[PDB]
Design an enzyme around this catalytic site. Structure first.
Site: not given
Ligand code: HEM
Ligand SMILES: Cc1cc(N)nc(CCc2cc(C#N)cc(CCc3cc(C)cc(N)n3)c2)c1
Ligand code: HEM
Ligand SMILES: Cc1cc(N)nc(CCc2cc(C#N)cc(CCc3cc(C)cc(N)n3)c2)c1
Ligand SMILES: C[C@H](O)[C@H](O)[C@H]1CNc2nc(N)[nH]c(=O)c2N1
Ligand SMILES: C[C@H](O)[C@H](O)[C@H]1CNc2nc(N)[nH]c(=O)c2N1
Ligand SMILES: [Zn+2]
Lengths: 405, 405
Positions: A109, A112, A281, A286
């Site tokens: 993330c 953070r 947000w 993305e």
């Molecule tokens: C406040 C604004 C936030 C921004 C701008 C942000 C930004 C991002 C971005 C760019 C990613 C990569 C996502 C992707 O490539 O699909 C990400 C992943 C992630 N974020 Fe955030 N984040 C935010 C808030 C949060 C919050 C509130 C949480 C949980 C409480 C969180 C937990 C995570 C987790 C667990 C991932 C990994 C998702 C995955 O493995 O698919 N983030 N974040």
């Molecule tokens: C809170 C928050 C804020 C923000 N700005 N962006 C995000 C990340 C969004 C995210 C969405 C998906 C979905 N659906 C998968 C991903 C990861 C891609 C993926 C791909 C697959 C196949 C499984 C898996 N668990 N994840 C990321 C979250």
């Protein structure tokens, strides 16, 4: 033991001591690094008790009350509950702390810096898909806040020994349908073909647009999932236009305001929350880069390149790179015009650098997955590219879990 | 499944298993507890014999003579030689194989589809710093070939029992001076401040431009390093211009044609070649994105954006992204115009995918470092971004080695 971590742009060094606190193995071994894999291959009272204690120790330490009466009594409550029942329950405040910590600990993330500002909804007194829907609606309304987005999580009932899980079947609270055509292609979002088909099968009347917002499939324990249509007024969306390119708006492109992940498991103190959707947000890359330009997503680069009249014949004209920039610019412009919260990848990575520094002082390190932190365009133009990062699993944690079907 | 890492491509949805990683004999820096894949530099007769036996086995496999009298006699010859002398020597075609194999094994090189096409100059007879100079000059002439570039490596004598090493002090055969100003800034390439100051210390008369070609500091066994100026006619350079922005030529930017890494150790069957410079041709992002736009290098992003009249006061105009694209296009265009081989990041990464497939069939895997293979602009626009990669060390190898001073 403790890795030296270097920033190559500034020549500064830190040492990660926080990694000594990892209790969970990642996928790498000394023989081979697997750090670039998306998923792990992977997908008792004594052990629950010690994760439980470690988390309670974490919580009382966070409120500076380590060793106090309240602390010892709480450890006794947890011990007494596990010994008799094989499980236990968190107090609301403990849950609140756990959710923020799981975010703080999330290596992928980049947002953070915000980790301390998280509205936490206790949905643990949920007993039906119907109730889940109400809670999900209140979350969406709160989080959206007319475009002034506010981070939030809603925590449904934990997993239990006896029974099926509470699950949100959708990977996000807002997703566009992907319709498999005769012609082999996909209309809409190719990432959501499987979820669109599960929806239809459970009785949804599909559309035929590129941006038909999906219904939610919500599953109470050991029951068929149920279908619920989100009220259109709850799903804020942003039509995409370009500041200088008039024809861009013509493309009919759009995206939703609220990034809300809903298929991940929240683990706190050995307890597992299989339904705990969370949102913040978007960072513009993305939408502009991955969702619109991935070749297995909306794959719109060519269309845009042709509109810009670029030389598509050859890679050397950097047409891909030029169209991508405009699409990202269109996303930023449009969100800004519509007064909906967005962050660009420069601003986001700069604040992630500040966060790294805060965490170094506070905890002696910060778990970070460089491949996910570095943006999908203009990598080395951002400061994170130049930053070495150590990746490891700390608990509380968000984890991947199996799909319910 | 097989108990080998499963590797996924997220664009095509295709799967492979890396079985090659089983051949790895050297541990990298990761452990179950933390991934250290993003770090740039993470960290006896019996041991030699065993590495030698392994390399000779690789050699005989490669010529399909594994098990033969010639194979077991060579083995015998190698151990006899170590028995009486402590070291051994490679036959000529053994060195050629091992050099190619070391390139083939390099996890950080995206250019590996070309690995079979390497001119190997044998310079194991070289016995003075002056002769090193001659060999190096012959390398550059051949490799440069008036702009139609050819991959090549020159191998100087291997490390000997308590005899001094052959060393080329410079990190590359071609480098621009970095002059530390009395106001604290740097004129030229800040990457090369130290080597510039070693050059002056050893009696070089410095210039004062941004693009002064450094002389070579060449060290023969047990001698102080000696200084050699490259004849300007041997150093092909490309003046940078833009296809449509006429003012870009006025910046007086340029880059040299030949990337020739000269500070790496080539290790084959335990033998250590401390001087063994090698060259290819550039991928355009090395020049136009890293060398020109890194904050800690030429840092020209702001200047170029100002000329382009971008809003350099707000991240969200994507001014950095737009300038970088133009600098990258100018590098490709100027090289094409000058008939000097170069490859753009799209064509290079596509070719690397083809290389991945060839190696899956030929060896069951390919060691690859995702952070280095993915280009530093347009990451997810290239197919390698969506390809999982396994990283491990195979030998023969190119390794980093401490600086000679
Ligand atoms: C406040 C604004 C936030 C921004 C701008 C942000 C930004 C991002 C971005 C760019 C990613 C990569 C996502 C992707 O490539 O699909 C990400 C992943 C992630 N974020 Fe955030 N984040 C935010 C808030 C949060 C919050 C509130 C949480 C949980 C409480 C969180 C937990 C995570 C987790 C667990 C991932 C990994 C998702 C995955 O493995 O698919 N983030 N974040
Ligand atoms: C809170 C928050 C804020 C923000 N700005 N962006 C995000 C990340 C969004 C995210 C969405 C998906 C979905 N659906 C998968 C991903 C990861 C891609 C993926 C791909 C697959 C196949 C499984 C898996 N668990 N994840 C990321 C979250
Ligand atoms: C034929 C054209 C080639 C191209 C386009 C190419 C491309 C590249 C690129 C883009 C990098 C990363 C460089 C950086 O970020 O600084 C690299 C690294 C590397 N390449 Fe190549 N390469 C080529 C030929 C070669 C040859 C001929 C060899 C050796 C025989 C080689 C061995 C290496 C090694 C050892 C690295 C890692 C160097 C380091 O860690 O600094 N490559 N290559
Ligand atoms: C044959 C060939 C073709 C091609 N297209 N590119 C290359 C490699 C380029 C490279 C050059 C240098 C240098 N100098 C350092 C690096 C590594 C960066 C670095 C930088 C520093 C300061 C230290 C260190 N250990 N490593 C890479 C080779
Ligand atoms: C295979 C590779 O690890 C995969 O494409 C990753 C790379 N980095 C990423 N980074 C982010 N933020 N999100 C992603 O989906 C990915 N995909
Ligand atoms: C911290 C990080 O590992 C470092 O900046 C790496 C990232 N990827 C790279 N990739 C290439 N090709 N060259 C580099 O110098 C780097 N630098
Ligand atoms: Zn690793």
């Amino acid at each position: 033991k403790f890795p030296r971590v270097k920033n190559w742009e500034l020549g500064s060094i830190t040492y990660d001591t926080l990694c000594a606190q990892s209790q969970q193995d990642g996928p790498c071994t000394p023989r081979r690094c697997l750090g670039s894999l998306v998923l792990p291959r992977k997908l008792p009272a004594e052990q629950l008790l010690s994760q439980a204690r470690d988390f309670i120790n974490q919580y009382y330490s966070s409120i500076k009350r380590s060793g106090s009466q309240a602390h010892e009594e709480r450890l006794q409550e947890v011990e007494a509950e596990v010994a008799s029942t094989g499980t236990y329950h968190l107090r609301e405040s403990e849950l609140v702390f756990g959710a923020k910590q799981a975010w703080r600990n999330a290596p992928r993330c980049v947002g953070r810096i915000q980790w301390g500002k998280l509205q936490v909804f206790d949905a643990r007194d949920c007993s039906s898909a119907q109730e889940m829907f109400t809670y999900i609606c209140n979350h969406i309304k709160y989080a959206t806040n007319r475009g002034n987005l506010r981070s939030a999580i809603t925590v449904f009932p934990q997993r239990a020994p006896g029974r099926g899980d509470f699950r949100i079947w959708n990977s996000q609270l807002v997703r566009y349908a992907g319709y498999r055509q005769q012609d082999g292609s996909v209309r809409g979002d190719p990432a959501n073909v499987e979820i669109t088909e599960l929806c239809i099968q459970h009785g949804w009347t599909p559309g035929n647009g590129r941006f038909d917002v999906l219904p939610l499939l919500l599953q109470a324990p050991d029951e068929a999932p149920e279908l619920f249509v989100l009220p259109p007024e709850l799903v804020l969306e942003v039509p995409l236009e370009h500041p200088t390119l008039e024809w861009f708006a013509a493309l009919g492109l759009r995206w939703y305001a609220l990034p809300a992940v809903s298929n991940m498991l929240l683990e706190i103190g050995g307890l597992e929350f299989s339904a705990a959707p969370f949102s913040g947000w978007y960072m513009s890359t993305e939408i502009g880069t991955r969702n619109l330009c991935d070749p297995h997503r909306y794959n719109i680069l060519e269309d845009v390149a042709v509109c810009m009249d670029l030389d598509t014949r050859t890679t050397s004209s950097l047409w891909k790179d030029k169209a991508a920039v405009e699409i990202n610019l269109a996303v930023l412009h449009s969100f800004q015009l519509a007064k909906v919260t967005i962050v660009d990848h420069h601003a986001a990575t700069v604040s992630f650098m500040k966060h790294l520094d805060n965490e170094q002082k506070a905890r002696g390190g910060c778990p970070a997955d460089w491949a996910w932190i570095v943006p999908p365009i203009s990598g080395s133009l951002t400061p994170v590219f130049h930053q070495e990062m150590v990746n490891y699993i700390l608990s509380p944690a968000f984890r991947y879990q199996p799909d319910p079907w």
